[PDB]
Structure formats: structure tokens, C-alpha cells
Amino acid sequence: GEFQRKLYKELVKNYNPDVIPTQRDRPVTVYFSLSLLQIMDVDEKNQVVDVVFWLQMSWTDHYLQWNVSEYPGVKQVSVPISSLWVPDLAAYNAISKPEVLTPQLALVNSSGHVQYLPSIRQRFSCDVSGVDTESGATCKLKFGSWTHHSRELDLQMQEADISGYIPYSRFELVGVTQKRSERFYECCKEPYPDVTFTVTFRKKG
Amino acid sequence: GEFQRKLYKELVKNYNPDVIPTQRDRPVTVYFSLSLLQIMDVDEKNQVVDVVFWLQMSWTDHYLQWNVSEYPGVKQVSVPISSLWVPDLAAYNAISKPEVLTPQLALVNSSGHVQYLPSIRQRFSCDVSGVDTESGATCKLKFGSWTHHSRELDLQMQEADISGYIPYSRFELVGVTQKRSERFYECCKEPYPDVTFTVTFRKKGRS
Amino acid sequence: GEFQRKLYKELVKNYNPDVIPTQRDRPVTVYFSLSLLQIMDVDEKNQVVDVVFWLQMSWTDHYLQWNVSEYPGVKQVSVPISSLWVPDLAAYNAISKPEVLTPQLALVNSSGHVQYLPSIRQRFSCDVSGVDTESGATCKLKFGSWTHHSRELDLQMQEADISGYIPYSRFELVGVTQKRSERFYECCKEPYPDVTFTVTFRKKG
Amino acid sequence: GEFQRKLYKELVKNYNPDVIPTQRDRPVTVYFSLSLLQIMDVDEKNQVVDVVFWLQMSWTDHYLQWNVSEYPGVKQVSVPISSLWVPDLAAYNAISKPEVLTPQLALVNSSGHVQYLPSIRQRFSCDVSGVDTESGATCKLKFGSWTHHSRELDLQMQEADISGYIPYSRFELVGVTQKRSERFYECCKEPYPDVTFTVTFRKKG
Amino acid sequence: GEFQRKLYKELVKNYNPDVIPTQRDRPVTVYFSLSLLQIMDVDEKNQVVDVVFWLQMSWTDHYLQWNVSEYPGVKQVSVPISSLWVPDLAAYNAISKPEVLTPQLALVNSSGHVQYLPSIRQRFSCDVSGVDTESGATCKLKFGSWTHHSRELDLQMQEADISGYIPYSRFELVGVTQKRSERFYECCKEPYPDVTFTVTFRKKG
Ligand SMILES: CN1[C@@H](CC(=O)c2ccccc2)CCC[C@H]1C[C@H](O)c1ccccc1
Ligand SMILES: CN1[C@@H](CC(=O)c2ccccc2)CCC[C@H]1C[C@H](O)c1ccccc1
Ligand SMILES: CN1[C@@H](CC(=O)c2ccccc2)CCC[C@H]1C[C@H](O)c1ccccc1
Ligand SMILES: CN1[C@@H](CC(=O)c2ccccc2)CCC[C@H]1C[C@H](O)c1ccccc1
Ligand SMILES: CN1[C@@H](CC(=O)c2ccccc2)CCC[C@H]1C[C@H](O)c1ccccc1
Ligand SMILES: O=C1C[C@@H](CCc2ccccc2)CN1
Ligand SMILES: O=C1C[C@@H](CCc2ccccc2)CN1
Ligand SMILES: O=C1C[C@@H](CCc2ccccc2)CN1
Ligand SMILES: O=C1C[C@@H](CCc2ccccc2)CN1
């Protein structure tokens, strides 16, 4: 409506989507979780797993807040992600670019909270040779910021989700785990956090 | 015409295609139907169906109206979708990005009714293991707004179409049903609607 | 060309490539030719034919005309098509997006006659089951405006043209017929013309 | 550096990369050569050859000159090709879009001489049926302007050799020729020049 | 943050990403190294190797420097590579475009030192006919500037890395060397440096 129209004019004014929305040297906290939907394929030769998954990501951008009293009815807006700052999360062991399956929009509410929930297909490097054993194969999907350390971008995970995994796949899901690590590199004194999702699966029968 | 050109210059003036055209607390009603054109392939190993279908979407955008008496002769205009708000409808169970096959333009008439009618190829997760049986395989093509709840974007469904299904495919179309649902999610305050097209089909040569 | 450079500055000024250049209730006539160059492949399982063809499309855009006396020497110019209104021609039974193989330019002369001549590869739905028989397979390649009716866009066809068919294909091009129809739809008062190119072909072996 | 920065501000001023930089009725002479690097594959069923080649293209853009003593040290610059007018050269018998393998930058020196030297992968229509015979298969890769005739764009060849042909492929070169022609087409009163690279090759062994 | 935002406004104002940041008598030194992460596939028929690798590239762009006291808290910023000058490094023997697997961002600090660390998947021409043998197959991945000679772009290599190579690939990484070379072409007075990465590998047994 007219109030959203006006809201967009205001927020866009000096907004720079290339600048991480830190304030007073405090990190932007980014919440992150992966829901595995489908294992599409495994390449036992080239050691690759092909997966479809749902990412849940959220963080606050203080430059995107407003008073609902100034914009009655407007509690949250749908925004193209290209028009706002987004975490530069990399899939560490991807061997293909992500194919984003869903509209590239984020949800923003009046306290500046952003929710971005893409469904994604992507291939990853993985030792899939256990895929026929009862042990099964174990694949790690590792994500983290490519250019921001812990003190700029504080990546945290939220509860994992398996309810969405399709039941009719030829791969059975035996276990999925999530953990947050902080790793140090010779380059820098600050750590870089990453969230790793560990999937254990096997062929049915 | 010269009047159509004047009309673009006005309909552009304060229009933001990123903003859903709700008015006065009222949701935008979006009518939606799918017509199955062809089942291109089934992947029995990976559980995927590859379909070409024609979507009919229409809604009213009250910011896109004009008096015909001011712009005489202009009953309607064809507008690239990137110049107007369009519903962020997503295929919930798709495993590939949609490939839009037709010009990305929408028809808009003087009372702001918009019609966007793309043809699309896309692949969906589906249990196709029964494709070789008499009862066939059943696939749910489930669509809904990715970000807009019911009270902003009121998704309604209109009468389907089977008449466009190509007769020479190796897949016999045994039926297509469509239903609108609406649920609450634990995440959010407002309910969300979706329209699901259920397609049952089998290989003509299954025996 | 200095005069050419001035002509571009001037022509752009009030030009809107989204506006069909009808004038005085008259439809824009669009001449449409298709020259089949090569049948790349047939998929007998999925019922698809993969073709390379040359489209010739011309029409007059009255907003693109100029006085040659004002721009001496400038009789025709070569212009990116993205800067011009172009007919929204759809391939009705295509199952892939068109791959345009040639520079995306159109010729425009001083009376505003545009010629756009892309070479295109594209896959179409087709019953190719008879391809190995003596009768061969028949594929219809159907095109028409997606959003403009007859009184706005008058699609006219030109000579059938088989001369570009490569002679070393494994497919023998029996013949190519063509027809224009004005189809009515329940939705609308006005008909929408389409041109259909019917291609009959068979394996040389 | 600083002089180069100042040069850009001047050069960009009225520059239109959509406008062929002719002058005084005279064409823009464009030199062209092709050096074949590798035949990647042949498709005997669909009659296609997949090649990687090196184009050497050069021409004079008279709007891109400057006095070197006005910009001391600046004798040539690397410019993205999207900023420049470039010849609208097409591969007449390509069946795929060209895949440019190298940075899209052209060298431009102070008298307006432009060199653009892309390495390209591309598939062409070709009768490759004789590939396993002694005489081999002969493919013609034909290039020319898509929209400019002889009197606007004077395409000339320069000599090339086969030095860059990779020696460890499964194909050997039996013959290579490269020639410029000037033909009339049914459409136009003006001749259009082309350059054709004719390669004859066969499977080793 | 507010100071990062003011920093972007300031830099953008005069920055030109098309100008190489040389100064009179000083080339831009560019540091370069390749870490092989995985050999995805070898094509023994067409002579291609498909590899995933991490490039580390750095250089100083004096135009990107700022005074830290004018921008307290801001020691470094993440910048989209498309906003800055980047070395035009080409893969000499690549037969496909690079597929960049990581966010296209570089780290820039207050001295104007730019670090760009992309993960890349790319296919190269290589004689892999020895891959099943004892001595294995040897591939040269050759990189260097496509258009800048030594006195403009001083390409230099740094310490290599094998640590990242995946231990579960079917290919056993035997040896890896890197060398910086300087080559003259008949065309040009000035030499063009390249860094070449030599990989020896074999199928596991
Ligand atoms: C990019 N790198 C850190 C920075 C850094 O290393 C670095 C910084 C500056 C100079 C040299 C190296 C930032 C956080 C991500 C990390 C990624 C890891 O390297 C990596 C690279 C390639 C494959 C897997 C993992
Ligand atoms: C996106 N989601 C609702 C929003 C929401 O969940 C949500 C919102 C905010 C926070 C956390 C979750 C809105 C309506 C669509 C629905 C989609 C479905 O989840 C879904 C997820 C993954 C694959 C298929 C379908
Ligand atoms: C799009 N349609 C006409 C418009 C219209 O139908 C229509 C208009 C408004 C409302 C509902 C339907 C315009 C001319 C093209 C025609 C196309 C055909 O439907 C069609 C759709 C999908 C595959 C093949 C053919
Ligand atoms: C494009 N065409 C000429 C232009 C022209 O014909 C033309 C001009 C104006 C109107 C109608 C046709 C210019 C020079 C190249 C020539 C190309 C060849 O036809 C051709 C067509 C299809 C595939 C391969 C080659
Ligand atoms: C582009 N070329 C040099 C310049 C130059 O040759 C050249 C310059 C001017 C005119 C003619 C040729 C610059 C440094 C890179 C070198 C590339 C090599 O040729 C080459 C070409 C094709 C595949 C692999 C390698
Ligand atoms: O804004 C975004 C997009 C989202 C994509 C996740 C991803 C990126 C690259 C490779 C794999 C997955 C992360 N943040
Ligand atoms: O925003 C849009 C895109 C257009 C296409 C419909 C679609 C989207 C996603 C998956 C399948 C189909 C409708 N509205
Ligand atoms: O401006 C244009 C492009 C031309 C393309 C024809 C086409 C469209 C869609 C599918 C296949 C071919 C039509 N008008
Ligand atoms: O500016 C340019 C691009 C270069 C590409 C040549 C080409 C085009 C189309 C198919 C094959 C090769 C020519 N001039």
C-alpha cells in the first residue's frame, strides 16, 4: 500500500547493501540452520553428493527499523535480497554454484530483523563410498563467512530440522548433526566461525 | 500510441514494483490455475518429474488504473513483469529453477486487472515409483507465496484445464485435481494459503 | 560518424521500447520468415525436436524515423535490440528457451523500418515417432504474439525458405509448409494471429 | 595511474559504443585471423565440431586517440570491451553461442588502434563423416559482420599459422586455409565480406 | 557501521575500477598462488582435466587507502570485486570459463592492500594419457596477465599448498611445483610474466 511505498523511499535513502550493519563495534549476529530435503544423487567415482536443502538465516539490520505508528499496518515487508546486506556465507566444500530454487526475497520487520529462507540445490565434495554399508556415508556441509571474522559477523546455529526430508528417496537418513566451530588462520588474529551440518545416509535395502 | 506513451509516463511516476498493492487493509486477491502441457520425463532413480505447464495468474493492482476518457483508445497495455509487482509464487516441492518459456509480459487493463500467463518447464520432487502400474504415479505440484501471508496475498484458485495436454507423449494423463489449503505455521503469526495440483499419470507402455 | 552519433542522442530522447508503435488505430504489421537450417537431434522417448533456424522479422516503428537531410549520409543504422520495441513473439510449443546464436542487433532505416534477423537454436515438443518411416515425422513450429491481438499486431508470413537446410544432416528435409490463422479465445473479443511452420523429415538411414 | 585516470574522463565524454566509428564515407577496416588451438570433439551423428580457437582482431577507432605528451607515459590502455564499439562479427555456421575463455579487455593505443584477442570455445555445424579416413573431414568456420556491409566495415584477414595447435590431441591437421571473400546476399545491394577458416583433420592412428 | 558507510561514499567518488593502480616507474605487484583442492575428472579421449582449486591473490591499490583516524574502528572492509580494479589473470590453457564457487568479495585494508581468495572449478587442456601409469600424468596450469606486461603488472608467486587436497579422491596427488617465468612475444618490447603450476597425479590402485 501507500504506507509501504513511503516506507521503501525512506529506508532506501542512504542504505548501502555492501556495508555490514555493525553498530558500536559489535558483531552482526547471524542465525543459521539447514534442513535437508532430498539427497538427489551420489557420485561414487568423483566423490560428490547432490543435495536439496532449506536454509534458515536471520540477523538484525538496525538500518532497516521503523515505528509501526509512523507506518500503520506495516509490520513486515518483503524485500529483494539484492537490495539489502546479506551474510557472505560460503559453502566450504561445494564443487558447484548454488542453485537457489525459491524467490530471492527476505522478510524484514519493524525492529530490523531480517529473515532469508532460500531452498537450494548444490553439489558438495564427500567420501560417499560407505553409501552401501550399514555404517553408511557421512557428508559434511560446511558453511561460514568468506570475508568476516567473529567480531564482525557472529555466526550462530539454531535447532536442526529433519521433518522436511522426503520419505520416498532411495537413500535413508540415519542421522544429521550440527555444530559451530571457530577456526584460526595464519593470516589473522581473529577467528572465523563456521557451521557444519553432518549427514549420515545409506541406500535402502 | 502517443496516449499509450503518456500513460506509461504516469503509471511509472510513483510506482514501486517491489511493493504488494494492498489497499486499505485489504489483501490482494490472486487467482491461480495450472494447465499441464507435457510430462517431459520421469527419473525413477532420483524421484523427479519434469513437466511443462501453463500458469494463469491474475490479480488487481489498484495503482495501475486510468480513465479511458483521458487516454482514448487505450483499453489495455502489455508491460514487462519487471516493471510491476507480481506475486512471489513458489513451487514448494521443485528441485530446479523454473524455466519461463514465454515473453515475460503481463496484460493490464484500465481498471488495474493484471494477467500474467507464463508457460514454464520445471522439475519437481515426486514419488514416481508407480508410473508403470495401473494406478500410476501421483505428483503434487504445490504452489504458494514465499513471503506473503493470507491477509496480504489471498491466493484463490480458478478452474483448471486438461485440454492442452499433448496427446503423443509416452505418459497417459489419468487425472488432475486442484485444491486450496491454508495453514498456520509455528514460526509465524498469520496463516498462509497454497494451491496444490495433483497429477496422476502412467506410462502408456507399462505392460 | 558524427551525424550518426547525434542521431542516437536524439532518437533515444522520448523513446519507450515498452510501447508498441501503433498509430491511428492501425496495427503494427510484422513480417515473419523462418528458414530451417538444421535438425540437430530428435528425442524419440520424450517427443522433442531440436532445431536451428533463421528468423527474419521486420516491421515499421514510426517513432524511429528521421530526416536524411538532417543527418546526411545516415541511411540505416545498426542498433542493439534491447533498445527497441520488439514483437513479443512466442514459440507456442517450445520446451526450451531460445538460444540466440547471432549478434543481438537490428537494422533500422530512416523511415523507421526495423529488420531483426536472429539465428536461433531451440527445442520443441513434437511427435517424432514416424522419423524412421518413409512418411517421416511432422513437426509444427508455432509462433505468435503472446499479449497483442490482431488489431494491434498483424503477423504476416513470407516465402517458405528451405535453401539454408544443411545437406549433410542425417535427416532428409522432405518439405516445409506454412499457415497463418487468427485464433479466437474465450477470454477476449479480439483474435490472436499465429504462424505455423510444418516440417516433415525422415532419417536418410 | 593518474594520467590514465585523466585520459578516461576525456575519452568517455561523448563516446557511444553502439556507433560504428566510421569517418569521411570510409569504412572501419577490421583485421581478423583465427588460430585453432584444439578440436575438442566431433559429433558424427549430429554433424558438429567443437573447437577452441584464438581470434586476433584489430581496428582503428578514431574517437579513441590522444596526445601522448598530454598524458606522459600512457601509450596504451586495457579497456573492457563493453565500453568500446566492437565489430558485430558472427560465426555463420555456429550452433552454439561463443564461450569466451579470456578476460574481455581490448588494448587501445594513442592513435586509436584497438586490439581484442579472445580465446573462444564454440561448436559449429560440420560434415565430420570423413574424420576416420585418410582424407579426413573438412570444416569451414565462416565469420563476418552480421549487419554491416563492405562500405561500413571493411573486413580483412591477416595471416595466421598453426603454431598454437596442441600436439597431444587425437586429431591431426591435414590441411588449413584461410581466405576472405565478398558475396552478395538476396537482401542487399551491397556486398558483405567474410573470412573463412577451412580446416581438414582426421583421427591419428 | 556509520564510518564504514562514510568510507564507501568517499572511495566511490573518485575511484575507477578500470584503471590499473600503477605509478610512474612502479608496476602493481600481484602475488599469486594456487592450492589444488580436487581433481574432479579426467577426460582421456579429449585430453581435459577438471579441477577445483583455491587461488590466493593480493596486490596494493593505493587509491583504496584511508586514514584510520578519519574512520576509527575500520581496519578492513569486504568489497565486491566488481567494484575494484582486479588483475586480468587468464588461464592460458583453460578450455572452459572459471566457475567461481565462493562469494565474489575481496578484503581491503587501510593501506589499500587487497586480498581476493576465490575457490574455482575450471577445465584445462592437458595430456592425461599417462594417468593410469606409474609416472602418472602431468598437467600445467598456466596463469598470467592477458594484456599487462611486467612493467605494469609485476606478477609474483608465493608459497604453495597441498594440505587442502582431499584424501578420498580417486586420483593420488604425486607432485606439485610452481614457477614464475617471464616471456617475450614478437609483438611487444616488454615481457609478460606467467606463473605456471605443474601437477603430477595418478589413478589410485
Ligand atoms: C578464506 N579463509 C580465511 C582467510 C584466509 O585464509 C586468508 C586471509 C588472508 C590471506 C591469506 C589467507 C577467511 C575465512 C574462510 C577461509 C577459507 C579457507 O581459507 C579455505 C580456503 C579454501 C578451501 C577451504 C577453506
Ligand atoms: C516459507 N514458509 C513460510 C515462512 C516460514 O516457514 C518461516 C518464516 C519465518 C521464520 C521461520 C520460518 C511462508 C510460506 C511458505 C513456507 C515454505 C515452507 O516452509 C517450505 C520450506 C522449505 C521447502 C518447502 C516449503
Ligand atoms: C495467451 N493466450 C492468449 C491469451 C489467453 O489465452 C488469455 C488471456 C486472458 C485470460 C486468460 C487467457 C493470447 C495469445 C496466446 C494464447 C496462448 C495460449 O493460451 C497457449 C498457452 C499455453 C500454451 C500454448 C498456448
Ligand atoms: C545476415 N545476412 C546479411 C543480412 C541479411 O541477410 C538481411 C538484411 C536485411 C534484410 C533481410 C536479410 C548480412 C551478412 C550476413 C548474412 C547472414 C546469412 O544471411 C546467414 C543467414 C542465416 C544463417 C547464416 C548466415
Ligand atoms: C595475449 N598474448 C600476449 C599479447 C599477444 O600475443 C599479442 C599482442 C598484440 C598483437 C598480437 C598478439 C599478452 C600476454 C598473453 C599472450 C597470450 C598468448 O598469445 C596466448 C594466446 C592464446 C592461447 C594461449 C596463449
Ligand atoms: O545471502 C545469502 C545467500 C545464501 C546462499 C547460501 C550458499 C551460498 C554459496 C554456496 C552455497 C550456499 C547465503 N547467504
Ligand atoms: O514471481 C513470480 C515468478 C513467476 C513464475 C512462477 C513460478 C515460480 C517458482 C516456481 C514455479 C513457478 C510467477 N510469479
Ligand atoms: O524480439 C524478438 C525475439 C524473437 C525471438 C523469437 C522466439 C521467441 C521465443 C521462443 C523462440 C523464438 C521474437 N521477437
Ligand atoms: O567483439 C567481438 C566479440 C568477438 C566474438 C566473435 C564471435 C561471435 C559469435 C560467434 C563466434 C565468434 C568478435 N568481436
Ligand SMILES: O=C1C[C@@H](CCc2ccccc2)CN1
Ligand atoms: O579478473 C580476474 C578473475 C580472477 C580469477 C582468476 C581466473 C580467471 C580466469 C580463469 C581462471 C582463474 C582473478 N582476476
